[PDB]
Amino acid sequence: YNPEKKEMIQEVIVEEDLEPFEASKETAEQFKHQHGDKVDIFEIPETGE
């Protein structure tokens, strides 16, 4: 904890689709549950992620 550098988080609306990133099945499903139609989750048949 550095009071000179106090961590916060700013809510922003995504203005452009971000590059896809890998995630687990459960993690991706949680992301889909949160964002609804504002996220796309797709299985990778090569590794099942």
* Contacting positions for other proteins (CB under 8 A): 16-17, 40, 42
Closest CA to 14 of 43, 44, 37: 37
Min separation Cβ 40 and other proteins, Å = 5
Min separation Cβ 36 and other proteins, Å = 12
Q: Which is nearer to other proteins, 16 or 26 (CB)?
A: 16
Min separation Cβ 41 and other proteins, Å = 9
